[PDB]
């Protein structure tokens, strides 16, 4: 196990919530797939602080607020799926574009 | 010899500007008849 | 009539492909972010070739 | 070393002032927490004038700058929620919602907006970045029960959160191509090879940097969060949150890559030939008021990024005066667009018609700020372009200056479609307010803070360019550091 | 041009979008002529 | 001297014009704004004759009214006002007609607190296009006129007021842009940054750089002074105004973009002038031939003369590309007199409209036989068109074709087909001004006088603003030298300062 | 599928041809102790900013999922109908 193998996982762990941002239409596998995005980049940056630089580790440092932020990104993002099927009584992302043009 | 600008605009710029005063006082057709009104080209 | 319908025509031509140029791009934006997130993704691969060379 | 960050500690507190007091006095505490939010932004906006003469020191272990270009941003951050409390003093008490609630999530934008400006590490960049971002999203749906703010405060979500992860994985990439090193000066020193991981790294931290300040390829989140947002959300972010993009772009393409340099004033010229044709052809198919002033928004943010990609002393110094000017624009026009969504339902264009004998304060307010979003003489936005110009003269860039004076002509058109329906129009040709204005009052909740932020508003639109020359000084110091 | 053919000595019959055209390129024509012989002919 | 006199002249107006929604006693109509607007409007042309018939000081090449105030160190632009030449003549024929406009605005009562605003806005604005010795400023003042005189015509106007606006709003300042371009151009060339007009004309310019400079300010001055490709916004802009806006529109507004092909374009681009005269003149002749049988060809009357200023301002274009001290001489008469003929003539249209109400002039015949000093002022200003001698309309034309061919600039068979084809419109004119004054007030056959045009008669108030405009009219036509004795020292150097270029 | 397949030829050919610096050092000397040394001496300013974003999203993510059942045919006031949660600018068409 070498860093090029930590990065290549998460270069594609980051490229599989990419294609589940565009793909899902289901509004919270949309936010499921951020949060596979939101690991994609602590993959790529502890890798990143336990092969460079890991006698004063920065990246797990900065590895925990990207867990706090996607921690409260969730939550903020959940109220935002419960605020919409209370007035829009389904959970679908091809029904919401109501504001086309 | 030539007749310069400076000394008759000097004389006939109060004479200019009292007969403004006055004519306006003095005017017909803008307020008895009156026909366009308040838009003054439609 | 050369006057009010050629030399006229084309300031009325400058105005006219850019009000339907606005009416083109308007249909750029059609709601469902899946799409709005897809023209993010594909830019960021375009300025990774364009900058490269 | 805790002195440098003062402006925004003094928001801390009294952002858990009117906190404690929505639950200890219960929507009672309406009437005064606005106005102790005002002194507590008023109190932050003049502890910034003793750190003015300070010479740049570098606080909290190399974490936080107190230059004179952190503290002229923290300035317009706390400028934009000073003008926005003073709107949504009734906008927000008229939904039924709570007003304590409301000034919450919108001074923790103010204070993440506002430590953007300082910031020079990686981790407080994104933290900074984040609660901006994630405090945005909750005011953009904040009335909750419309299906037009619920889709915009999604479509914000799920943009937002995903362009904060493109953020992430460049700037996780600069902690890697680096030897550690968080910080954007130790970045620096590091990395000047130009290779291909510092592109990448450069393209991905661009798609978030470059989302605050809605460039065309990553703008497509505004006009539909503008319309369905609150419109002192739609206010907030289209000069607070707009300017901490702003404020982070010159702070760290600068900072993190003064090696790589002619690669991402490449692109953000493509940035801004985009979103000056597109944030001003687009806004001319608009009918929605809060609409026309989104794709302006896009547009007004390619003249800004006209002095950014030029790289001089001026250059520099010409998107800092036009920013300082925009929230005088941007706040005067927002201003009257809820001063009439606030008597009259439905504010959109062609129904503004038959104006200026009902309303001639919100016609002279809306005019002079539309005016000037047009820069016609002698107003501030006027002045704001002549110096985005003449510094876009100064060092090459012949087509992106001529480019935008072309569309500041197309700008004028959409402008001035505004003028038309308010003033042009006679009284046989309005549609809503045909004899239904509700004869306006200035003794109403609320309103006297939304008059005052018109009147000086407009003031600061109407004589900021003839009276610059302070302000050029004010902003030609902001300047000398930055590399 | 039915405004421009009002009851007066105008409206001769030549209005139609053919003749617009075969007007434009010997008016137009004479202008540029003129303008290509001015940088020639004057010095 | 010491006291500053054309930044207040520029800057009493604009002041003045905040008064104007503090008036009191808005009892109906707006009576004592019109009397404020008037009262501000003579007393700020006292101030233009107080500072020229005590400190102008002519005969004299140069500023004499330079006040250089400093205003952004950081850009380089100040406040740097004078009059030298080709501004003071302009300067006080602005301060002349703007007074009459605010008197010819009497009959306005739609909206009267935003009419005597705009019209002061543009009385502040418009002396500042000639008086400021500067790039970024005379740039804020020329489109200084660009938002008053959108709402001049959008508010008070004919019909397809709203089509004539906003092709005008997009014509201008579309062109405008090219000042800046040209602007900025001219004052980064070398090493020093000043954006005044004095060290930009004293500055040395490449030849191939100074031929986009030429075609910038051609494009853009092209637009105002109305030459025939760039031309079609005027007839719309021009044909729907009512009588006191287009005082401004074709007296004043035309005269900045003739003033500044003299200042901007010979004096500081001597080289590029030399190289591009002979289409000017090109241009100059095919803009009379051009405007005056489409003047012919049309029937509403205010589209009629409206098309007439534009066949007078090609009289400018053969006297500035014609190198001569006459020939100048006649390019700046042509501009002061046009102005004077053309506020009068355009005066009279929406005093002829004010009791018809139809401008077709077909339904028009024997308006003559019901009033009759309108038909008295009517003809007497459309003679004044004519370059009839014994008014300023002849010798502005006659100076031109004397000025023209005996210039030693062009050739002998390029002389004299200018001059023939010049000509053509001392025989054009007459053919649709007198038809036009047949066609209305000529004849037996009047209207049907019980629908449309139930009124008829004659305000001493519209006789006095004929008979003071027709003073400088007839006055410079019985002694020209009475107007070029301000301008004979400073036309002297703007022709000798191209005399050093010409062998090219 | 295609720009997912596109950043992933993107990223591997960035990861394999980036030289990276690694340090052959011991790591994590009890990696417990030199992350809390690091929430208050370089990353202080962080952590204090993570508490006014939580408290944030507790203040916003309540008041965007509870339920209106203090008065939801609430009437406040009224220049023109405003309907009580939702923005005054109401929908219509052009």
């Known amino acids: 196990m070498q860093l090029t193998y930590v990065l290549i996982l998460a270069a594609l762990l980051f490229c599989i919530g990419i294609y589940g941002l565009v793909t899902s239409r289901n509004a919270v596998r949309v936010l499921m797939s951020i949060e596979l995005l939101l690991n994609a980049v602590n993959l790529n940056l502890i890798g990143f602080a336990n092969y460079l630089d890991g006698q004063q580790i920065k990246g797990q440092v900065f590895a925990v607020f990207v867990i706090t932020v996607a921690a409260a990104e969730a939550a903020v993002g959940l109220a935002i799926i419960l605020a919409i099927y209370r007035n829009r009584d389904t959970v679908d992302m091809e029904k919401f574009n109501l504001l086309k043009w | 010899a030539v007749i310069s600008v400076k000394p008759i605009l000097l004389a006939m710029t109060p004479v200019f500007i009292l007969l403004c005063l006055f004519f306006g006082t003095r005017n017909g057709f803008y307020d008895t008849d009156q026909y366009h009104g308040n838009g003054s080209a439609h | 009539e050369v006057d009010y319908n050629v030399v006229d025509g084309v300031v009325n031509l400058t105005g006219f492909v850019t009000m339907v140029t606005g009416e083109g791009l308007k249909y750029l934006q059609n709601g469902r972010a899946q799409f709005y997130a897809l023209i993010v993704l594909l830019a960021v691969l375009g300025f990774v070739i364009f900058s490269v060379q | ?483 | 041009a039915t405004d421009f053919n009002r009851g007066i000595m105008k409206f001769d019959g030549a209005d139609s979008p053919a003749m617009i055209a075969i007007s434009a390129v010997l008016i137009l024509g004479f202008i540029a002529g003129l303008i290509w012989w001015a940088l020639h002919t004057a010095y | 001297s010491t006291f500053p006199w054309l930044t207040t002249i520029i800057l009493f107006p604009i002041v003045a014009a905040l008064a104007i929604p503090f008036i009191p006693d808005p009892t109906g109509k707006g009576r004592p704004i019109r009397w404020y607007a008037l009262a501000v409007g003579l007393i700020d042309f006292a101030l233009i004759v107080y500072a020229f018939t005590n400190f102008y000081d002519l005969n004299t090449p140069g500023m004499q009214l330079w006040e250089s105030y400093d205003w952004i160190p950081e850009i380089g632009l100040r406040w740097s006002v004078g009059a030298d030449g080709l501004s003071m003549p302009l300067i006080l024929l602005t301060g002349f007609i703007t007074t009459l406009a605010i008197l010819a605005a009497w009959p306005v009562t739609l909206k009267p607190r935003l009419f005597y605003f705009l019209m002061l806005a543009m009385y502040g604005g418009q002396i500042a296009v000639f008086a400021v010795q500067d790039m970024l400023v005379f740039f804020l003042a020329w489109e200084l006129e660009l938002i008053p005189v959108y709402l001049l015509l959008a508010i008070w106007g004919g019909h397809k007021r709203q089509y004539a606006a906003t092709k005008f709003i997009l014509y201008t300042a579309g062109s405008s842009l090219f000042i800046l371009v040209a602007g900025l151009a001219m004052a980064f060339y070398g090493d020093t940054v000043s954006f005044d007009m004095q060290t930009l004309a004293a500055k040395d310019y490449a030849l191939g750089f100074q031929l986009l400079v030429y075609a910038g300010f051609l494009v853009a001055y092209g637009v105002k002074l109305p030459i025939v490709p760039l031309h079609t916004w005027l007839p719309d802009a021009h044909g729907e105004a009512t009588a006191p806006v287009h005082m401004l529109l074709a007296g004043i507004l035309l005269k900045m973009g003739g003033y500044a092909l003299i200042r901007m374009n010979v004096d500081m681009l001597p080289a590029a002038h030399a190289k591009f005269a002979p289409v000017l003149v090109i241009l100059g002749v095919v803009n009379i031939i051009y405007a005056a049988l489409t003047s012919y060809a049309q029937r509403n009357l205010k589209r009629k003369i409206a098309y007439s200023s534009i066949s007078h301002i090609g009289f400018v274009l053969i006297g500035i590309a014609s190198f001569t001290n006459l020939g100048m001489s006649g390019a700046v008469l042509q501009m002061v007199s046009h102005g004077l003929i053309g506020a009068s003539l355009f005066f009279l249209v929406g005093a002829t409209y004010d009791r018809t109400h139809t401008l077709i002039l077909e339904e028009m015949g024997g308006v003559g036989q019901k009033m009759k000093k309108i038909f008295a002022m009517f003809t007497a200003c459309s003679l004044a068109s004519l370059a009839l001698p014994g008014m300023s309309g002849f010798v502005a034309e006659l100076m031109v074709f004397i000025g023209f061919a005996t210039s030693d600039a062009y050739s002998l068979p390029f002389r004299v087909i200018v001059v023939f084809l010049a000509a053509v419109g001392v025989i054009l004119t007459p053919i649709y001004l007198l038809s036009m004054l047949r066609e209305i007030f000529y004849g037996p056959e009047n209207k049907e006088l019980v629908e449309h045009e139930a009124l008829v008669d004659a305000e001493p108030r519209e006789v006095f603003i004929i008979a003071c405009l027709l003073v400088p009219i007839i006055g410079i036509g019985l002694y020209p030298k009475l107007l070029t004795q301000i301008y004979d020292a400073t036309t002297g150097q703007v022709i000798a300062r191209a005399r050093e270029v010409l062998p090219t | 599928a295609v720009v997912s397949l596109g950043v992933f030829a993107l990223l591997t050919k960035m990861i394999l041809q980036t030289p990276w610096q690694l340090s052959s050092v011991p790591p994590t000397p009890d990696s417990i102790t030199t992350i809390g040394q690091h929430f208050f001496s370089d990353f202080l300013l962080p952590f204090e900013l993570a508490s006014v974003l939580l408290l944030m999203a507790l203040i916003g993510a309540v008041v965007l999922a509870r339920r209106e059942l203090v008065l939801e045919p609430e009437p406040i006031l009224g220049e023109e109908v405003v309907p009580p949660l939702e923005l005054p600018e109401r929908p219509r068409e052009p």
């Open chain 4, 1 to 483: 070393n805790a002195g440098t960050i003062l402006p925004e500690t003094i928001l801390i507190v009294t952002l858990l002032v009117v906190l404690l007091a929505d639950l200890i006095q219960g929507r009672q505490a309406d009437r005064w927490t606005p106005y102790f939010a005002i002194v507590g932004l008023g109190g932050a906006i003049a502890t910034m004038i003793p750190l003015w003469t300070q010479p740049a020191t570098i606080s909290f272990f190399g974490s936080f700058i107190s230059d004179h270009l952190s503290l002229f941003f923290r300035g317009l951050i706390a400028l934009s929620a000073l003008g926005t409390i003073l709107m949504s003093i009734r906008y927000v008490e008229q939904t039924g919602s709570s007003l304590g609630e409301f000034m919450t999530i919108l001074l923790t934008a103010t204070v993440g907006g506002m430590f953007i400006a300082g910031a020079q590490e990686l981790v407080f960049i994104f933290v900074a970045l984040e609660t901006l971002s994630i405090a945005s999203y909750l005011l953009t749906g904040y009335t909750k029960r419309d299906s037009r703010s619920n889709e915009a405060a999604l479509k914000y979500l799920l943009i937002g959160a995903a362009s904060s992860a493109i953020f992430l994985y460049g700037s996780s990439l600069l902690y890697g191509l680096s030897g550690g090193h968080t910080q954007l000066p130790a970045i620096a020193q590091a990395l000047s090879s130009e290779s291909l991981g510092l592109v990448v790294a450069l393209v991905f931290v661009i798609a978030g940097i470059s989302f605050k300040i809605s460039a065309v390829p990553f703008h497509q989140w505004t006009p539909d969060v503008y319309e369905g947002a609150p419109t002192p959300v739609v206010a907030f972010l289209s000069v607070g949150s707009k300017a901490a993009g702003f404020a982070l772009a010159i702070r760290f393409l600068t900072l993190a890559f003064p090696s790589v340099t002619d690669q991402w004033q490449l692109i953000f010229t493509v940035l801004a030939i985009l979103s000056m044709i597109l944030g001003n052809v687009v806004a001319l198919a608009q009918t929605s008021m809060k609409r026309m002033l989104a794709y302006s928004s896009i547009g007004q943010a390619g003249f800004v990024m006209i002095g950014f990609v030029v790289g001089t002393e001026a250059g520099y110094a010409s998107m800092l005066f036009y920013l300082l000017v925009y929230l005088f624009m941007n706040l005067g026009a927002f201003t009257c667009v809820i001063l009439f969504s606030l008597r009259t339902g439905t504010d959109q264009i062609s129904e503004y018609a038959g104006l200026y004998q009902k309303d001639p304060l919100l016609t002279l307010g809306l005019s002079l700020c539309l005016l000037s979003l047009g820069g016609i003489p002698p107003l501030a936005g006027f002045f704001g372009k002549i110096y985005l110009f003449w510094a876009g003269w100064q060092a090459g860039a012949y087509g992106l200056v001529l480019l935008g004076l072309l569309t500041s002509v197309i700008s004028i058109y959409y402008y001035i479609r505004v003028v038309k329906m308010m003033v042009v129009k006679e009284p046989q040709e309005m549609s809503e307010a045909v004899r239904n204005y509700p004869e306006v009052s200035w003794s109403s909740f609320g309103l006297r803070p939304l008059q005052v932020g018109l009147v000086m508003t407009v003031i600061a639109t109407s004589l900021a360019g003839i009276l610059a020359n302070p302000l050029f000084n004010l902003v030609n110091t902001a300047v000398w550091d930055v590399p």
